[PDB]
């Protein structure tokens, strides 16, 4: 590559990994969102709290590969497994596996970063921490706020309290 | 001083005990407000609520410094003590705990507006009327309004009247 | 904690130390302040300059204290100690002293950062670079700048240079 | 009188002895105002400073009458002493006369509003405070911070001192 300077082709396969894991995180949050649009679910707020993150995780995967190529580096594209469940449940019970998908990609961010830090490269680790780390942080910070009032309701009464996560915290 | 005038070193050293009280009483305010925005609790309007007060209380210390020195007096600082809990219990511990905090702010107002009036100091007495005596009411009242209703909604199912109270009351 | 993830306890305790640091130094402010709206003192600019960092060290120890909730560590609060005088001297008494603080603040910024590297922590180190290290070296620089400033001025006439630089390099 | 009620004898004659003295404020701040304009005096700023305070202390006695006719007493107009000197010195001669004349009305104000307490008069009372002790506390803090900012620069080197307050501070 004419570009290419202090990329390492550990970093490289480690992003086109990155990006399959964002893929399949938007494909499972995708699944999720549809579960709550089904007739004998019906939480629009839900519906729409996962299909907005099915958006956002497609876009990291964008910014991913664009940086790939700023970089010289070679984008590969994999299977996408697909998600996980097929049904998923209670709010909580999608809250609490959106919570270990996130953990899961942060854990995945956090050792890119190690890697790059690593391998030398600051770009790499300036490029994770601006658009990927702090993100990440708030939006377990949210699900998990989302989590505590979802127990705290369900708890109650389980429907009753349902309806009014989705009615009054849920857009 | 060249501008003093009828302002005994007994309200002097009173306003200066006040300005500690209503510094501490922020710093009371700041740690129930964290504490409401912790994951674990996650009631944004409390913290919120809470928050509010915070900036009110360190307001009413810097109107206290401004007069302080408008009288011709010297500010005198102290140590802060840490707020009183580490961690605040359910909204109604909460509540509870600011209305005993602000019941106190209360009586140190009194107590220094009888001192003026025994000193005959008529300023003080204006100053404490207009900017802190009908504040404390109006919170005070606030504050027992908001009790009654938490108490009538925890009494019913305590984790869902803590949500619906926050959501419907609390900004 | 449902949220945490790699985040130190020794790290979460750090950030503890430095959001009372932080208030300590608004507290400082708070009290330089004042000072300078003595009527034996009466520098309106120096007044406001100290008063606006006491505003910008309790707005950095509230974003501390969020950044703790979103990692999911615990906010704990200590006394906060009263400042270190009563009264502050002539302006470039109080700027050598406030460069002494900012110093200080800086040290404790720096030493977290260190923290949070050997810990791996780049979130933190992030957050730090961010928010905190170049708006302390922002400031440091600015009361070098003033210092210097009020030092040609008190060395060729004390009082006369004094008010010159209150009234046309302060606010 | 068909509306007074509750309106001493000894009130209503201490508020014509006011009126006085506050007239002669007036009158003493009219000569301070154009000595300052005399051309081998030319500080505009303190002309300007005094003349403001001239029509300050007119609406004040303004007030007073307003509130005799309100309350059913009867104005009654004594001479108007010639002020205490024909010429006034410089800056901080004059600004100190300012701070004693000031001074004298607020101690008048102080003896009326014990005079109205001792009444039982809460109206007379409520308008000192609201109308008249403030605005002097307020005031004699401003002289207070002008005189020592005056002396800060005349102790360096009178003439220029004098000159820079003037432009600087004054309006």
Do not use: N, T, W
């Given at each position: 590559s004419q570009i290419r300077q202090n990329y390492s082709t550990e970093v490289e396969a480690a992003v086109n990994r990155l990006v399959n894991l964002y893929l399949?995180?938007?494909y499972t949050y995708?699944?999720?969102?549809?579960?709550?649009?089904r007739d004998?679910?019906?939480?629009?707020?839900?519906?729409?709290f996962f299909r907005q993150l099915a958006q956002q995780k497609r876009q990291g995967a964008e910014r991913l590969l664009k940086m790939q190529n700023q970089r010289g580096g070679r984008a590969l594209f994999q299977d996408l497994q697909k998600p996980s469940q097929d049904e998923w449940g209670t709010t909580p019970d999608a809250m609490?596996?959106?919570?270990v998908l996130e953990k899961s990609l942060n854990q995945a961010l956090l050792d890119l970063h190690a890697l790059g830090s690593a391998?030398?490269?600051?770009?790499?680790?300036?490029?994770?921490?601006?658009?990927?780390?702090?993100?990440?942080?708030?939006?377990i910070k949210k699900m998990g706020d989302h989590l505590t009032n979802i127990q705290r309701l369900v708890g109650s009464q389980a429907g009753l309290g349902e309806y009014l996560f989705e009615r009054l915290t849920l857009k």
């Open positions: 399949r995180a938007s995708l699944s999720l969102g549809f579960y709550f649009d004998d679910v019906a939480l629009e707020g839900v519906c729409h609490k596996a959106a919570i391998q030398a490269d600051p770009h790499l680790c300036d490029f994770l921490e601006s658009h990927f780390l702090d993100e990440e942080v708030k939006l």
